[PDB]
Fold Ryanodine receptor 1.
Amino acid sequence: HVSSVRPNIFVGRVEGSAVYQKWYFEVTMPHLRIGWANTTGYVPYPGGGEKWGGNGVGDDLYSYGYDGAFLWSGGAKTGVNRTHAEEPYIRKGDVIGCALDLTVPIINFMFNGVRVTGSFTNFNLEGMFFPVISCSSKLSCRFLLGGEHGRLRYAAPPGYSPLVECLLPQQILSLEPCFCFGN
Ligand code: NA
């Protein structure tokens, strides 16, 4: 009953770049986790090609999730302060903010425009990061990427870009050296 979705959006670290290294998106509306997954979590598949090594965001070593009450990575959960005392920790109308600063690196979360006290730091930067929701049946959640792809309810943090700006052109020489493809 638990599925994961991502848009076809991948961001990655450019050594020493001061532009488009910080990304923000929101999610709005049983299991529900939101965050970022890194493509290092993909593993070889017998026939050939690769499959995702985990079930949902936060269950493998290379994804980083938040369910309203806990931070998740590598299948471990870390309690944070919460807006609802009991499950469901994320309710209809609530809006989850999710932020990735590749220069630190650090991943932060927000609940209804309030910063979550808890973050992911010092994580692997090889490969690329994509936004992800892991949801059970009977839940319908939407990525808010900015622009006409889902209006953000909150201002992106200072220095951060909505993911819809992945559609803007950048010069190739300014996008290297990068770590998106595995050293
Ligand atoms: Na890249």
In short: Residues 12, 178, 180 surround sodium ion (CB under 6 Å). The chain has one domain: 2-174. The longest strand covers residues 129-136. The chain has no helices and 15 strands.
